[PDB]
Design a protein around this ligand. Structure first.
Ligand SMILES: Nc1ncnc2c1ncn2[C@@H]1O[C@H](COP(=O)(O)OP(=O)(O)O)[C@@H](O)[C@H]1O
Ligand SMILES: O=P(O)(O)O[C@@H]1[C@H](O)[C@H](O)[C@@H](OP(=O)(O)O)[C@H](OP(=O)(O)O)[C@H]1O
Ligand SMILES: [Mg+2]
Ligand SMILES: [Mg+2]
Length: 216
Protein backbone atom coordinates (compact mmCIF):
# COMPACT_ATOMS: atom_id res chain seq x y z
CA UNK A 1 0.00 0.00 0.00
CA UNK A 2 0.82 3.78 0.00
CA UNK A 3 4.00 5.28 1.62
CA UNK A 4 3.72 9.13 1.81
CA UNK A 5 6.86 10.86 0.39
CA UNK A 6 8.75 12.94 3.02
CA UNK A 7 8.11 16.38 1.41
CA UNK A 8 10.31 19.10 3.03
CA UNK A 9 7.94 21.95 1.93
CA UNK A 10 4.79 22.61 -0.19
CA UNK A 11 1.39 20.87 0.31
CA UNK A 12 0.78 18.52 -2.74
CA UNK A 13 -0.10 14.81 -2.25
CA UNK A 14 3.28 13.18 -3.11
CA UNK A 15 3.81 9.41 -2.58
CA UNK A 16 6.56 6.89 -3.46
CA UNK A 17 5.98 4.97 -6.71
CA UNK A 18 5.17 1.22 -6.44
CA UNK A 19 8.68 1.11 -8.08
CA UNK A 20 12.20 2.37 -7.03
CA UNK A 21 13.42 5.93 -7.86
CA UNK A 22 9.92 7.27 -8.75
CA UNK A 23 7.64 9.71 -6.84
CA UNK A 24 3.97 10.31 -7.85
CA UNK A 25 2.77 13.97 -7.52
CA UNK A 26 -1.02 14.72 -7.59
CA UNK A 27 -1.79 17.75 -9.80
CA UNK A 28 -4.58 19.98 -8.32
CA UNK A 29 -6.78 22.54 -10.22
CA UNK A 30 -5.54 21.55 -13.76
CA UNK A 31 -2.84 19.65 -15.76
CA UNK A 32 -0.89 22.95 -16.36
CA UNK A 33 2.22 21.35 -14.69
CA UNK A 34 2.00 18.49 -17.32
CA UNK A 35 1.37 21.00 -20.19
CA UNK A 36 4.50 23.01 -19.10
CA UNK A 37 6.74 19.85 -18.75
CA UNK A 38 5.79 18.93 -22.37
CA UNK A 39 6.15 22.57 -23.56
CA UNK A 40 9.72 22.70 -22.08
CA UNK A 41 10.44 19.23 -23.63
CA UNK A 42 9.56 20.51 -27.17
CA UNK A 43 10.98 24.10 -27.17
CA UNK A 44 13.89 23.79 -24.60
CA UNK A 45 15.08 20.10 -24.41
CA UNK A 46 18.56 21.18 -23.10
CA UNK A 47 17.08 23.21 -20.16
CA UNK A 48 14.87 20.17 -19.29
CA UNK A 49 17.89 17.73 -19.37
CA UNK A 50 20.23 19.96 -17.23
CA UNK A 51 17.83 21.34 -14.56
CA UNK A 52 14.46 19.44 -14.25
CA UNK A 53 13.70 15.97 -12.79
CA UNK A 54 12.68 13.47 -15.56
CA UNK A 55 8.90 13.13 -16.06
CA UNK A 56 8.60 9.35 -16.85
CA UNK A 57 4.84 9.70 -17.55
CA UNK A 58 1.29 10.45 -16.35
CA UNK A 59 -1.41 8.34 -14.58
CA UNK A 60 -4.74 10.28 -14.42
CA UNK A 61 -3.83 13.31 -12.18
CA UNK A 62 -0.46 11.79 -11.02
CA UNK A 63 2.93 12.88 -12.52
CA UNK A 64 5.49 10.00 -12.29
CA UNK A 65 8.68 12.01 -11.48
CA UNK A 66 12.37 11.12 -10.89
CA UNK A 67 12.99 11.03 -7.09
CA UNK A 68 15.89 13.56 -6.76
CA UNK A 69 16.77 12.00 -3.31
CA UNK A 70 16.96 8.39 -4.64
CA UNK A 71 20.76 8.20 -5.35
CA UNK A 72 21.68 9.43 -1.78
CA UNK A 73 22.43 7.39 1.40
CA UNK A 74 21.67 10.41 3.69
CA UNK A 75 20.03 13.19 1.63
CA UNK A 76 19.62 16.75 3.02
CA UNK A 77 17.00 18.73 1.00
CA UNK A 78 16.21 22.50 0.88
CA UNK A 79 13.28 23.96 -1.16
CA UNK A 80 13.99 27.64 -2.14
CA UNK A 81 11.19 29.49 -4.05
CA UNK A 82 12.81 31.56 -6.91
CA UNK A 83 9.66 32.16 -9.06
CA UNK A 84 7.12 34.93 -8.25
CA UNK A 85 4.74 34.12 -5.34
CA UNK A 86 0.95 34.21 -6.08
CA UNK A 87 -0.12 36.76 -3.38
CA UNK A 88 2.71 37.56 -0.83
CA UNK A 89 6.25 39.02 -1.33
CA UNK A 90 9.37 36.82 -0.79
CA UNK A 91 10.46 36.09 2.84
CA UNK A 92 14.13 36.98 1.89
CA UNK A 93 13.41 39.79 -0.65
CA UNK A 94 14.34 38.05 -3.99
CA UNK A 95 13.59 34.39 -2.95
CA UNK A 96 11.84 32.40 -0.14
CA UNK A 97 13.32 29.39 1.71
CA UNK A 98 10.20 27.11 1.84
CA UNK A 99 11.68 24.33 4.04
CA UNK A 100 14.67 22.02 4.62
CA UNK A 101 15.67 18.69 6.27
CA UNK A 102 15.36 19.21 10.11
CA UNK A 103 13.95 22.79 9.58
CA UNK A 104 11.44 22.32 12.48
CA UNK A 105 14.40 21.63 14.91
CA UNK A 106 15.78 25.18 14.14
CA UNK A 107 12.21 26.69 14.47
CA UNK A 108 12.12 27.60 10.73
CA UNK A 109 8.69 29.08 9.85
CA UNK A 110 7.79 29.40 6.12
CA UNK A 111 5.61 32.49 7.05
CA UNK A 112 8.38 34.44 8.95
CA UNK A 113 9.91 37.37 6.96
CA UNK A 114 13.72 37.15 7.45
CA UNK A 115 16.58 39.70 7.60
CA UNK A 116 19.80 39.03 5.57
CA UNK A 117 21.28 37.55 8.81
CA UNK A 118 18.35 35.08 9.49
CA UNK A 119 18.35 34.05 5.76
CA UNK A 120 22.10 33.13 6.00
CA UNK A 121 21.60 31.44 9.44
CA UNK A 122 18.87 29.16 7.92
CA UNK A 123 21.15 28.17 4.97
CA UNK A 124 23.94 27.53 7.58
CA UNK A 125 21.32 25.38 9.47
CA UNK A 126 20.64 23.41 6.21
CA UNK A 127 24.45 22.93 5.89
CA UNK A 128 24.90 21.74 9.56
CA UNK A 129 24.40 18.01 8.54
CA UNK A 130 27.60 18.48 6.40
CA UNK A 131 29.78 18.44 9.59
CA UNK A 132 32.67 20.82 10.55
CA UNK A 133 34.75 19.43 7.57
CA UNK A 134 34.99 23.09 6.36
CA UNK A 135 36.33 22.29 2.84
CA UNK A 136 33.98 19.40 1.87
CA UNK A 137 30.98 21.78 2.51
CA UNK A 138 32.96 24.38 0.43
CA UNK A 139 33.02 21.81 -2.48
CA UNK A 140 29.19 21.33 -2.11
CA UNK A 141 28.66 25.15 -2.21
CA UNK A 142 31.00 25.50 -5.27
CA UNK A 143 29.16 22.75 -7.26
CA UNK A 144 25.80 24.47 -6.43
CA UNK A 145 27.29 27.85 -7.61
CA UNK A 146 28.55 26.17 -10.86
CA UNK A 147 25.04 24.92 -11.83
CA UNK A 148 23.10 28.03 -10.53
CA UNK A 149 25.47 30.24 -12.69
CA UNK A 150 24.67 28.17 -15.85
CA UNK A 151 20.92 28.26 -14.92
CA UNK A 152 20.81 32.09 -14.42
CA UNK A 153 22.71 32.36 -17.79
CA UNK A 154 20.27 29.98 -19.65
CA UNK A 155 17.18 31.74 -18.14
CA UNK A 156 17.97 34.87 -20.33
CA UNK A 157 17.04 32.86 -23.50
CA UNK A 158 13.82 31.22 -22.06
CA UNK A 159 10.39 32.87 -22.66
CA UNK A 160 8.55 31.53 -19.55
CA UNK A 161 7.26 33.18 -16.35
CA UNK A 162 8.57 30.65 -13.75
CA UNK A 163 5.81 31.69 -11.24
CA UNK A 164 6.23 29.60 -8.06
CA UNK A 165 9.14 27.33 -9.20
CA UNK A 166 11.57 26.12 -6.48
CA UNK A 167 15.25 25.12 -6.42
CA UNK A 168 15.64 21.73 -4.60
CA UNK A 169 19.20 21.73 -3.13
CA UNK A 170 20.40 18.22 -2.09
CA UNK A 171 23.67 17.05 -0.44
CA UNK A 172 24.68 13.75 1.25
CA UNK A 173 25.81 13.80 4.95
CA UNK A 174 29.31 12.64 3.78
CA UNK A 175 29.33 15.60 1.22
CA UNK A 176 30.33 13.00 -1.50
CA UNK A 177 27.37 14.07 -3.73
CA UNK A 178 25.15 17.15 -4.25
CA UNK A 179 22.88 18.69 -6.93
CA UNK A 180 20.21 21.39 -7.44
CA UNK A 181 17.19 21.15 -9.82
CA UNK A 182 14.00 23.19 -10.57
CA UNK A 183 10.53 21.79 -9.61
CA UNK A 184 6.82 22.89 -9.36
CA UNK A 185 5.73 24.07 -12.86
CA UNK A 186 2.07 24.20 -11.59
CA UNK A 187 1.80 28.04 -12.05
CA UNK A 188 4.36 28.56 -14.92
CA UNK A 189 3.06 30.72 -17.86
CA UNK A 190 4.09 31.46 -21.50
CA UNK A 191 5.40 35.03 -22.13
CA UNK A 192 7.39 36.68 -25.02
CA UNK A 193 10.34 37.71 -22.72
CA UNK A 194 12.69 36.13 -20.11
CA UNK A 195 11.81 36.19 -16.35
CA UNK A 196 14.00 38.91 -14.69
CA UNK A 197 12.31 38.32 -11.27
CA UNK A 198 13.46 34.62 -11.32
CA UNK A 199 16.93 35.54 -12.75
CA UNK A 200 17.37 38.06 -9.82
CA UNK A 201 16.42 35.24 -7.35
CA UNK A 202 19.20 32.93 -8.73
CA UNK A 203 21.89 35.73 -8.84
CA UNK A 204 21.02 36.79 -5.21
CA UNK A 205 21.32 33.07 -4.17
CA UNK A 206 24.67 32.83 -6.09
CA UNK A 207 25.84 35.98 -4.19
CA UNK A 208 24.87 34.51 -0.75
CA UNK A 209 26.36 31.00 -1.45
CA UNK A 210 29.60 32.69 -2.79
CA UNK A 211 29.99 34.72 0.49
CA UNK A 212 29.55 31.37 2.38
CA UNK A 213 32.05 29.45 0.15
CA UNK A 214 34.65 32.26 0.68
CA UNK A 215 34.49 33.51 4.32
CA UNK A 216 37.23 32.05 6.60
N1 LIG B 1 11.40 15.26 -8.09
C1 LIG B 1 11.48 15.39 -6.77
N2 LIG B 1 12.40 14.66 -6.09
C2 LIG B 1 12.45 14.77 -4.76
N3 LIG B 1 11.71 15.51 -3.94
C3 LIG B 1 10.80 16.22 -4.64
C4 LIG B 1 10.63 16.22 -6.01
N4 LIG B 1 9.59 17.06 -6.38
C5 LIG B 1 9.16 17.54 -5.24
N5 LIG B 1 9.86 17.09 -4.15
C6 LIG B 1 9.60 17.41 -2.75
O1 LIG B 1 8.28 17.88 -2.70
C7 LIG B 1 8.23 19.22 -2.15
C8 LIG B 1 7.15 20.02 -2.84
O2 LIG B 1 7.17 19.75 -4.26
P1 LIG B 1 6.54 20.85 -5.25
O3 LIG B 1 6.73 20.41 -6.66
O4 LIG B 1 7.02 22.21 -4.86
O5 LIG B 1 4.97 20.69 -4.94
P2 LIG B 1 3.87 21.51 -4.07
O6 LIG B 1 4.47 22.89 -3.79
O7 LIG B 1 2.65 21.58 -4.94
O8 LIG B 1 3.65 20.71 -2.83
C9 LIG B 1 9.65 19.76 -2.28
O9 LIG B 1 9.87 20.71 -1.24
C10 LIG B 1 10.51 18.49 -2.16
O10 LIG B 1 10.83 18.17 -0.82
O1 LIG C 1 -3.63 27.22 -3.89
P1 LIG C 1 -3.46 28.68 -4.48
O2 LIG C 1 -4.57 29.58 -4.05
O3 LIG C 1 -3.05 28.76 -5.97
O4 LIG C 1 -2.07 29.18 -3.77
C1 LIG C 1 -0.77 28.65 -4.09
C2 LIG C 1 -0.66 27.13 -3.85
O5 LIG C 1 -0.93 26.82 -2.46
C3 LIG C 1 0.73 26.66 -4.21
O6 LIG C 1 0.80 25.24 -4.02
C4 LIG C 1 1.78 27.38 -3.36
O7 LIG C 1 3.08 26.87 -3.71
P2 LIG C 1 3.91 25.93 -2.73
O8 LIG C 1 3.03 24.62 -2.62
O9 LIG C 1 5.23 25.73 -3.58
O10 LIG C 1 4.10 26.67 -1.46
C5 LIG C 1 1.70 28.88 -3.65
O11 LIG C 1 2.75 29.59 -2.90
P3 LIG C 1 3.61 30.83 -3.49
O12 LIG C 1 2.51 31.77 -3.67
O13 LIG C 1 4.50 30.95 -2.20
O14 LIG C 1 4.21 30.18 -4.78
C6 LIG C 1 0.28 29.39 -3.27
O15 LIG C 1 0.12 30.78 -3.56
MG1 LIG D 1 6.18 24.16 -4.57
MG1 LIG E 1 -4.60 26.30 -2.10
Amino acid sequence: SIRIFPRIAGRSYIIYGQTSGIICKRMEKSDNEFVIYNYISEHYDKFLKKYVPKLYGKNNDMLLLEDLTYNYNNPNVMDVKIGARKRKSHTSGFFSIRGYTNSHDYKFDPDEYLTSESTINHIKNFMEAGGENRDKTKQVLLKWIMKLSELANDLFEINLKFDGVSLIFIYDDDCSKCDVNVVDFSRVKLIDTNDQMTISAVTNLIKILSELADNP
